[PDB]
Amino acid sequence: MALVLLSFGVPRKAILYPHEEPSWSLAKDIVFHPYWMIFGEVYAYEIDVCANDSTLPTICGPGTWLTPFLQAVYLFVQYIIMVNLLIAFFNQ
Amino acid sequence: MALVLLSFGVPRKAILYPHEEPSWSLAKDIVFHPYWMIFGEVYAYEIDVCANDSTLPTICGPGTWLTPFLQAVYLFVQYIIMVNLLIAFFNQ
Numbered sequence: 451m452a453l454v455l456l457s458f459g460v461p462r463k464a465i466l467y468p469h470e471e472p473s474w475s476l477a478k479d480i481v482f483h484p485y486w487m488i489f490g491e492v493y494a495y496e497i498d499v500c501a502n503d504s505t506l507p508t509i510c511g512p513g514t515w516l517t518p519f520l521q522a523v524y525l526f527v528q529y530i531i532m533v534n535l536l537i538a539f540f541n542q
Numbered sequence: 543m544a545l546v547l548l549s550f551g552v553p554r555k556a557i558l559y560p561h562e563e564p565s566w567s568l569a570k571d572i573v574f575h576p577y578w579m580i581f582g583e584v585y586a587y588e589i590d591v592c593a594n595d596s597t598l599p600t601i602c603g604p605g606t607w608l609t610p611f612l613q614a615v616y617l618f619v620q621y622i623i624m625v626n627l628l629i630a631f632f633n634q
């Protein structure tokens with residue numbers, strides 16, 4: 451679940467924030483939102499940053515249409531596979 | 543879960559956005575919100591678009607009172623039936 455969390459966070463942070471000098475915020479922002487996503491959050495007005503209903507209308511640019519797909523695959527893997535692998539674990 | 547997701551998304555998008563020329567956004571918007579709904583999101587200030595507490599006071603019009611019902615049935619089917627069909631699957 452932390453390999454799935456960087457599989458999504460490193461592309462999401464690269465695809466969306468491409469003018470990043472080296473920083474420690476590149477250590478949070480590849481781990482931060484993909485962790486809270488597991489716990490009910492979706493950041494719905496940050497998915498599809500080029501949409502009109504965006505809290506991030508400045509993150510729009512080349513390649514940012516990939517992140518709704520990455521995140522779709524992410525949460526499917528988190529909730530529908532890995533969280534139910536915990537539940538199944540805790541049951542048995 | 544993707545038949546339930548278009549069973550809700552195609553009516554929700556037709557009942558609410560009825561002046562739609564053909565577009566590729568009719569390929570996202572019938573699949574987009576009903577997927578994030580599965581993962582904690584409800585879009586609470588977009589249900590009942592004619593309510594006062596609406597992020598969508600312009601989507602109000604004839605027939606939009608149907609979507610709180612469609613969505614009620616949707617999530618009942620997603621969470622309370624299909625997500626617990628996954629959990630039950632992953633257990634056994």
Ligand SMILES: CCCCCCCC/C=C/CCCCCCCC(=O)O[C@@H](COC(=O)CCCCCCCCCCCCCCC)COP(=O)([O-])OCC[N+](C)(C)C
Nearest residue numbers: 500501502515518519522544547566567569570573574577
């Ligand atoms: C292989 C296993 C099976 C996979 C299943 C299928 C996989 C998914 C298939 C989805 C169908 C294809 C959808 C995109 C179509 C083109 C979009 C487009 O042209 O523009 C869109 C751009 O926005 C995007 O391109 C973002 C990507 C869409 C969301 C991805 C799906 C995630 C949720 C669902 C995942 C599961 C759904 C389940 C399906 C029932 C919107 O239009 P625009 O105007 O260009 O943008 C606004 C910009 N503006 C404000 C500046 C104007």
Ligand SMILES: CCCCCCCC/C=C/CCCCCCCC(=O)O[C@@H](COC(=O)CCCCCCCCCCCCCCC)COP(=O)([O-])OCC[N+](C)(C)C
Nearest residue numbers: 500501510511512513514515519522523566569570572573
């Ligand atoms: C499934 C049931 C639903 C319907 C199905 C029918 C599908 C028909 C779809 C057809 C796709 C083609 C339409 C888009 C091209 C036109 C231009 C366009 O909008 O470009 C967009 C590129 O966005 C994309 O390229 C979207 C993703 C393309 C793949 C579609 C899903 C593949 C099938 C599923 C499997 C995939 C894997 C999923 C995981 C397993 C960019 O537009 P924007 O984002 O608005 O950015 C604009 C702002 N900017 C200029 C600053 C950048």
Ligand SMILES: CCCCCCCC/C=C/CCCCCCCC(=O)O[C@@H](COC(=O)CCCCCCCCCCCCCCC)COP(=O)([O-])OCC[N+](C)(C)C
Nearest residue numbers: 590591592593594602606607608609610611612613614615
């Ligand atoms: C067979 C199995 C049984 C199923 C169960 C029962 C089914 C549900 C039964 C529901 C009772 C009926 C409710 C609607 C009553 C009429 C509403 C009305 O006239 O006005 C309302 C309009 O808003 C709507 O019409 C939206 C529809 C109602 C919400 C849907 C319920 C979903 C959640 C519950 C689902 C779980 C139910 C749990 C039950 C305990 C509000 O007033 P207004 O002022 O017109 O609106 C503001 C507009 N204005 C700003 C322009 C003024």
Ligand SMILES: CCCCCCCC/C=C/CCCCCCCC(=O)O[C@@H](COC(=O)CCCCCCCCCCCCCCC)COP(=O)([O-])OCC[N+](C)(C)C
Nearest residue numbers: 590591592593601602603604605606607608611612614615
């Ligand atoms: C359960 C316990 C709770 C209470 C029970 C008692 C129930 C009493 C209910 C009575 C309903 C009649 C009252 C409304 C009629 C007056 C006019 C009106 O306000 O119309 C509204 C339409 O809203 C509707 O038509 C509401 C939905 C009708 C069905 C109600 C549930 C049936 C029982 C459950 C089975 C259903 C299936 C459920 C799923 C299995 C329009 O108002 P608006 O929406 O604000 O939009 C107006 C704005 N506009 C002009 C721009 C358009």
Ligand SMILES: CCCCCCCC/C=C\CCCCCCCC(=O)O[C@@H](COC(=O)CCCCCCCCCCCCCCC)COP(=O)([O-])OCC[N+](C)(C)C
Nearest residue numbers: 461465500509510511512513514515516517519520523566
């Ligand atoms: C059965 C289903 C199979 C489908 C599978 C998917 C196949 C299709 C895959 C990908 C479709 C690629 C085309 C969509 C982008 C067009 C829009 C665009 O250019 O947007 C932006 C840039 O976008 C880019 O710069 C993206 C460049 C192409 C893709 C880059 C690699 C990612 C895909 C890797 C492969 C992933 C494969 C995944 C396989 C699972 C900007 O828009 P513009 O128009 O350039 O200019 C601005 C707008 N204006 C001019 C109006 C002002």
Ligand SMILES: CCCCCCCC/C=C\CCCCCCCC(=O)O[C@@H](COC(=O)CCCCCCCCCCCCCCC)COP(=O)([O-])OCC[N+](C)(C)C
Nearest residue numbers: 553557560592601602603604605606607608609611612615
């Ligand atoms: C035991 C329980 C069983 C109950 C079952 C449900 C039975 C009840 C069924 C239906 C209730 C229909 C009446 C409610 C709407 C009235 C308000 C209205 O007209 O709103 C708007 C339009 O609304 C429309 O154009 C809707 C037209 C009728 C319904 C269309 C088919 C959908 C239901 C299919 C059947 C579903 C069957 C589902 C069965 C599971 C506009 O408002 P107005 O008033 O036109 O004028 C403007 C407002 N003003 C004048 C104040 C300025």
Ligand SMILES: C[C@@H]1CC[C@@]2(OC1)O[C@H]1C[C@H]3[C@@H]4CC=C5C[C@@H](OCCC(CO)CO)CC[C@]5(C)[C@H]4CC[C@]3(C)[C@H]1[C@@H]2C
Nearest residue numbers: 452453456457459460471472473474475476477478480481
């Ligand atoms: C197996 C896993 C693969 C992924 C991963 O773990 C192991 O690989 C690690 C490598 C790390 C980076 C290494 C070096 C730096 C330079 C630093 O520069 C300070 C500059 C300035 C600040 O202003 C000082 O003043 C910023 C941080 C950064 C980019 C790391 C970020 C986290 C990264 C990407 C880690 C990531 C979680």
Ligand SMILES: C[C@@H]1CC[C@@]2(OC1)O[C@H]1C[C@H]3[C@@H]4CC=C5C[C@@H](OCCC(CO)CO)CC[C@]5(C)[C@H]4CC[C@]3(C)[C@H]1[C@@H]2C
Nearest residue numbers: 544545548549551552563564565566567568569570572573
């Ligand atoms: C069994 C399932 C039943 C539901 C469903 O899957 C199979 O049936 C599919 C039919 C698809 C539409 C067919 C043709 C077009 C025309 C196109 O026109 C470009 C216009 C312009 C852009 O501005 C060009 O420049 C836009 C897309 C649209 C409306 C499709 C959307 C997705 C739909 C609704 C699919 C939906 C998920």
Ligand SMILES: [Ca+2]
Nearest residue numbers: 489490581582
């Ligand atoms: Ca939740």
